[PDB]
Amino acid sequence: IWGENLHFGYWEDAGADVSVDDATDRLTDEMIALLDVRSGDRVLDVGCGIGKPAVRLATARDVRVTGISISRPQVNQANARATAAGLANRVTFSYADAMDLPFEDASFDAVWALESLHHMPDRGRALREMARVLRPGGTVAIADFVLLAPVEGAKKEAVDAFRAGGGVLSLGGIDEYESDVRQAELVVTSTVDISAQARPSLVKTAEAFENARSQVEPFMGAEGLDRMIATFRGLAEVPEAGYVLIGARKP
Ligand SMILES: Nc1ncnc2c1ncn2[C@@H]1O[C@H](CSCC[C@H](N)C(=O)O)[C@@H](O)[C@H]1O
């Protein structure tokens, strides 16, 4: 239930009143730049959520996006959002699992995964499927949260809590993400630790929900809403809790 409810953002100032929606859009902008895409390419987006990132990509570059998810409501919302921005000709969404993708080999010019791989019960599988469907010359972009070091006591306690409510089936170090990418026979072009920029998202979104307590409360219940706010505030204070951007390429 804390899965499709937290979207990390890119924060730079320490001292500018930008919205949670502002920081999320900036992060997306780093991913757009990190894919390396030009007029006429095709892009696969794995774990599309409700479609915001894919619509932003389409507003920025002239490409075909297809988005993928294992939650039926989300596919319907994403498609409505696409049809609503008039991008139905090129932006489209369907229901499929990244552990077994139903696409032709070498279909896409590019692929991306924004905050989705930590759900997969096995990152390797997913990345292998992703390489299998990119054409040689094709590029990849990953954005996800990581554990920079092993933890204990109350630090481990605050991390576990987060994984429970967000369904984080596999959390790992950067070094682990890298060799997962290398196993799929992709070449790694950049890896950047953006912890310091991503961190503020946690307290800042705890605040947002608070402001909306009486309008979200009936959907989640009081105690559920409280545990989610508490769990973010705990995670914010464990500095072993990190975030990384990774670009990669197919020989
Ligand atoms: N095994 C899997 N295969 C394909 N999609 C999956 C998956 N496991 C989880 N997902 C989907 O991936 C998403 C992860 S949350 C990612 C949010 C999205 N990037 C956004 O900001 O809009 C969820 O929508 C979830 O339904």
Side-chain angles (χ1 to χ4, degrees):
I1 203 166
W2 318 333
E4 174 43 52
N5 272 142
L6 173 76
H7 312 283
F8 275 91
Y10 196 93
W11 307 78
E12 200 177 309
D13 270 280
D17 275 325
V18 299
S19 68
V20 124
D21 295 298
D22 285 349
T24 310
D25 285 335
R26 218 274 170 59
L27 175 52
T28 300
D29 288 337
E30 300 298 307
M31 291 285 283
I32 293 167
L34 183 73
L35 275 194
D36 189 18
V37 89
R38 70 152 171 139
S39 185
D41 296 356
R42 308 158 190 283
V43 188
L44 178 65
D45 167 36
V46 181
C48 61
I50 62 165
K52 290 171 79 101
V55 168
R56 200 180 226 272
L57 172 55
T59 304
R61 310 274 130 99
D62 207 23
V63 292
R64 301 199 148 270
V65 194
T66 96
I68 274 320
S69 172
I70 57 153
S71 177
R72 290 285 258 258
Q74 289 189 350
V75 179
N76 305 341
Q77 285 183 237
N79 278 313
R81 161 169 268 100
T83 237
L87 305 173
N89 297 180
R90 36 166 190 141
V91 200
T92 160
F93 302 86
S94 41
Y95 169 91
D97 188 343
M99 306 280 275
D100 191 330
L101 301 163
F103 305 113
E104 204 81 15
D105 308 286
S107 314
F108 304 104
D109 312 75
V111 76
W112 87 6
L114 168 44
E115 279 172 43
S116 62
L117 296 178
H118 64 244
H119 295 290
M120 318 293 159
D122 168 36
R123 267 178 282 145
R125 196 55 171 88
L127 286 165
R128 283 194 297 272
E129 272 297 280
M130 295 169 58
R132 211 259 308 160
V133 175
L134 207 63
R135 103 265 203 266
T139 66
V140 178
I142 297 149
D144 219 349
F145 42 85
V146 284
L147 190 77
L148 319 158
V151 289
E152 279 189 19
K155 273 178 176 181
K156 185 167 179 63
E157 223 165 84
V159 168
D160 287 320
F162 185 77
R163 300 181 77 190
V168 186
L169 313 197
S170 66
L171 170 86
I174 285 99
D175 42 354
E176 299 189 327
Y177 263 83
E178 295 180 291
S179 54
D180 284 353
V181 179
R182 291 195 194 99
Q183 263 206 132
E185 299 188 84
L186 300 163
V187 176
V188 173
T189 62
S190 58
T191 82
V192 173
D193 182 331
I194 59 162
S195 291
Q197 292 76 250
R199 189 160 291 116
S201 310
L202 280 150
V203 156
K204 204 82 173 155
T205 76
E207 291 182 324
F209 276 93
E210 206 90 40
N211 289 0
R213 154 168 268 110
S214 75
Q215 22 281 303
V216 313
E217 203 188 89
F219 292 101
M220 293 187 65
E223 84 168 67
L225 209 218
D226 283 347
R227 273 187 263 124
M228 178 185 157
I229 297 168
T231 184
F232 299 168
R233 288 198 207 256
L235 190 81
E237 292 296 313
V238 22
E240 292 91 341
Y243 202 90
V244 79
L245 294 184
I246 300 178
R249 210 186 64 209
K250 179 191 194 186

